[PDB]
Amino acid sequence: GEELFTGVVPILVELDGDVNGHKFSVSGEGEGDATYGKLTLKFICTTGKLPVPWPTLVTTLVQCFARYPDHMKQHDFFKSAMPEGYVQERTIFFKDDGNYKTRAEVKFEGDTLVNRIELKGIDFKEDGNILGHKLEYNYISDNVYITADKQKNGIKANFKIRHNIEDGGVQLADHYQQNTPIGDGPVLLPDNHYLSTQSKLSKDPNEKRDHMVLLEFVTAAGIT
């Protein structure tokens, strides 16, 4: 499975979302180079204006592109599930606001790594930081804490994203994650570790559609 990642791999992302009844879709394209933990992606809202902030979608919109140090390669669940892929599910609780629930299938379609996602958001405040578009657009950086889930032959993870708000404050997004293989072959069930992830958000100055450019680095850590 890891052999599929030694070079540059094209990526396609497709998301359908509904947040407090606001429906939208996002498409993305780019490439990943797991040797360097490196992702370059561009996302477009294909239905018009995105009804939530782009930064709140970053985590939802391919952790198989993590750089695992040589000494940790036996702990890389994500690549070990390929090419058949895995189901990635989250609940994302926005403190003092609504939540997202997401279900994605991440797998190869030929030579392209595809992430197909459905997102449902409920209980948001119409004037909160999310539906009110009060978040900064710049960077997200944090650590994804992974543990084995022997019962689903997969993994769980938990992490926090501390989104900066335009007034100087913070909007916390508490993430709970589960991944389960699609296929029936052996997978690597890891010791506890984390992915150190840095996402840089930008705009394509020639792009008139509502969009997000992402440069991301993802590195496994936490084992000696």
Domain count along the chain: 1
Nearest to 115 by CA among 220, 8, 13, 7: 13
Q: How were these coordinates obtained?
A: X-ray
- Please give the torsion angle defined by the CA atoms of residues 135, 138, 141 and 144, in that order, rounded to the nearest 10 degrees: 60
CATH code of the domain containing 176: 2.40.155.10
The range of the structural domain enclosing residue 213 comes to 1-224
Nearest to 177 by CA among 165, 159, 152: 159
Question: Which H, E and C letters describe the chain, residue by residue?
Answer: CHHHHCCCEEEEEEEEEEECCEEEEEEEEEEEEHHHCEEEEEEEECCCCCCCCHHHHCCCCCHHHCECCHHHHHHCHHHHCCCCCEEEEEEEEECCCCEEEEEEEEEEECCEEEEEEEEEEECCCCCCCCCCCCECCCEEEEEEEEEEEHHHCEEEEEEEEEEEECCCCEEEEEEEEEEEECCCCCCCCCCCEEEEEEEEEECCCCCCCCEEEEEEEEEEECCC
Strand bridging mode 193-202 / 211-221? antiparallel
